[PDB]
Amino acid sequence: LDKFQPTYTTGSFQLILGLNAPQVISGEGEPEGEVFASLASLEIKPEAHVQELEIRLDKDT
Amino acid sequence: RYLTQHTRNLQPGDTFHALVEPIGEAPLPRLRLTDSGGKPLAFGLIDQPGESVELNYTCDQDICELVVHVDGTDGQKDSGEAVYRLLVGINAPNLRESGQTPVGSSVFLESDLVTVGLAVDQIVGVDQRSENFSVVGTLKLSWHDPKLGFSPDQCGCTVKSFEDASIRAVAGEINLPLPSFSFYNQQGNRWSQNQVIFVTPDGRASYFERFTVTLQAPDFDFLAYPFDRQKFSIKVDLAVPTNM
Amino acid sequence: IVGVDQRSENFSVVGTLKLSWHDPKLGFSPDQCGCTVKSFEDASIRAVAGEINLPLPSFSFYNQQGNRWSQNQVIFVTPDGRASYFERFTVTLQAPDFDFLAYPFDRQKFSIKVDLAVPTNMFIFNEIERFQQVVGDQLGEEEWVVTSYSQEITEVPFERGSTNSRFTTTLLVKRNLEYYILRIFVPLFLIISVSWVIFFLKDYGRQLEVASGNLLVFVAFNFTISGDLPRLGYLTVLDRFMIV
Amino acid sequence: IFVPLFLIISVSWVIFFLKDYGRQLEVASGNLLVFVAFNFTISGDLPRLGYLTVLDRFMIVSFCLTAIVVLISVCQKRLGAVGKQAVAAQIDTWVLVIYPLVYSLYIIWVYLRFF
């Protein structure tokens, strides 16, 4: 509220998918039936996270 | 450079209107309407005259809470002063009408103001060598909150009292924030032999405390000693920012 | 600055300490709470951390003597993970760098040391933030005058194969000479000058009474000076003057 | 504080009426030590200030004034031995009015500034 800055949100979640199941809107019930979709992603989407640093050693450390 | 205000709850199907009118030829600010979390809902618009910013919004959710922000951090640097005029209304079509009297029918914003009062009962002593003094007195804090309200039928009681460290435990259960104070010029430890709070069903609260503290007096002047005059000050500071 | 004790070589200060670190955990969604910040006070800080098992940084004053009085301990948590810890304290610290060789024209330095209570593999000090001026405008202590200050971050060995970060704040002070001139240097000068004047007269046998009387008054002055100094193992400037 | 200091100064000034040279030396020397004792008593209830107050300024005047008496008395005794008794008597009259005049000036200065 002090300042305006749009950013991104990170964290965990719990995705629920149902096919012709009107009882899953409330979040209740348990998975049943057959396989609806595959969790594996078609692509890989490589990133470019590269970091470099230097360190100094010592007898104590 | 930033101003934020809280509003009351809005029933479904209700509207909201805001307007900014500069007075001292100050630059137009930026105004937006968001919720308690901060998610934006509407943005201010500047008309052709450029002397007013108008915002309108309607809510479809069951419970609606709106917070109004005024932005001035992008104005002229080292500005001497900047005064504007802010008028709002919930069910107020054609807000620029009805007389626009400052004394409205009813309040529209929230209430987080605190009333404070202090008294002095004793003066333990004054130490010139260390430039400090000790006093005994009572401090009262009072504020109004629509929550922490209990129905008398379920309890059969008119007031509720909490003492010792039980005050913090009750607040944690309802997660409600509480005001915190501190003596700015306090030296050492402060002895408080009584800490009670009274809660009244409509929402009113009162906090009492009897204390014995030692305070610093840095305004000692011995130039006219022993015909000198000195002043002693007691400072109480809230431990929360001005936005709470 | 509450006071400085030369006999015990220690001093007491009142100030504020701020700690801040970033952790991706302890993040709350504003939608579920309708709040922007969260605050924990008193001993409730440790209870919350135990529920989430998250480690917390612990600090300690390395040169602290006795007990430390802290009248405020609050922590602010911001949803993305930022945290800030504030504390107002009143502590007594040891000053082992006292040097009385140039007394009373000597200069001394006072240091405040803060040490993390965790090894270097958990929490380290990597930056210094000045949220307020290090030396306040009002400090009392009409005797000592603060001239300069400095802050730095270092690490020191601990146990066998462990190290911890250290935060040091050093204050350089000087001693006012108004009191010593008025009450010590001036009374001694007139007494010596008065005795030398009597030598102008050739009244043999009168110098014996004056010299014998001056022997006793110097003994009284000798004990007065030693009252505000410890049992040092070396002679200062004042003692050398008294020997002559 | 104020009353005990006033009688001591007034008593010393009374002794100046007698022309007993050599007795003023004992009184002036004795008054030097009693002022030192008063100096330490006042500072007991005050911090180590870096400036002079009204009381310390008064003590400085008394310390310096009693030093001139010792020097004057020694000169009068030395002059009497030579045979200039008339000159010594003239100095005695002059010092009779200098002693109260100096103290009166300090009181006026305090009243003009702080009152």
One-letter amino acid for residue D103 of the chain: Y
Q: Choose among B144, B178, B64, B65: nearest CA to A1.
A: B65
10 Å Cβ neighbour count for C65?
Answer: 13
Positions of E strands within B26-184: 30-34, 40-43, 45-46, 53-58, 67-71, 84-89, 114-127, 132-144, 160-163, 181-183
* Residue to substitute from D23, D29, D48, interface C, most C β-carbons within 10 A: D48
- At D56, give phi and psi (nearest 5°): -65, -35
Technique behind the model = cryo-EM
* Cα dist from A51 to A48, C22, C122, whole Å: 10, 19, 21
Cβ proximity of C226 and D103 under 8 Å: no
Look at residues C194, C189, C179, C199 and name the one whose alpha carbon lies nearest to residue C241. Answer: C189
Picking from B222, B223, B228, B230 by the largest number of D CB atoms within 10 A of its own CB, the best residue to mutate is B222
According to DSSP, the residues that pair with B186 across neighbouring strands are B215
Q: Are C151 and C200 in contact (CB under 8 A)?
A: no
Copy the structure tokens of residue D33. Answer: 């030590």
Q: Are the C-beta atoms of B86 and B20 separated by less than 8 Å?
A: yes
Asked if residue C89 lies in contact with residue C69, where contact means CB atoms within 8 angstroms, the answer is yes
> Which letter, b or e, does each residue of C92-130 get, where b requires 16 or more Cβ atoms within 10 Å of its Cβ?
bbbbeebebeebbeeebbbbbbbbbebebeebebeeeee
Q: Using a CB cutoff of 8 Å and minimum separation of 24, what contacts does D9-16 make? A: D9/D62, D9/D103, D13/D99, D13/D100, D16/D92, D16/D95, D16/D96, D16/D99
Omega before C104 within 30 of 0, i.e. cis = yes
C41 assigned ligand-binding residue: no
CB contact under 8 A, B131 and D54: no
CB within 8 Å: D47 and B129: yes
3-state SS track over B139-191: EEEEEECCCCCCCHHHHCCCCEEEECCHHHHHHHHHCCCCCCEEECCECCCCE
CA C113, C114, C118 angle in degrees (round to 5)? 140
How many whole angstroms separate alpha carbon C78 and alpha carbon C39?
A: 9
B227–chain D Cβ distance below 8 A for any pair: yes
DSSP per-residue letters across C94-150: E-TT---TTTTS-EEEEEEEEEESS-TTT--------SS-SS-S----SSEEEEEEE
- Which one, of D105, D64, D88, D110, lies nearest residue D16 by Cα? D88
**What's the Rg (C-alpha) of chain A?**
23
Residues 6+ apart with CB under 8 A from C10: C4, C65, C92, C93, C94, C95
At C60, which amino acid appears?
S
| Residue C141 labelled as part of a binding site | yes
**Whether the Cβ atoms of residue B32 and residue B40 lie closer than 8 Å to each other:** yes
Other Cβ atoms within 10 Å of A51 Cβ, number? 4
The tally of CA atoms less than 13 A away on the side-chain side of residue C173 is 24
How far is D30 from D34, CA to CA, in rounded Å? 7
Cα distance between residue B194 and residue C112, in whole Å: 35
Query: Cβ–Cβ of B32/A4 closer than 8 Å?
Result: yes
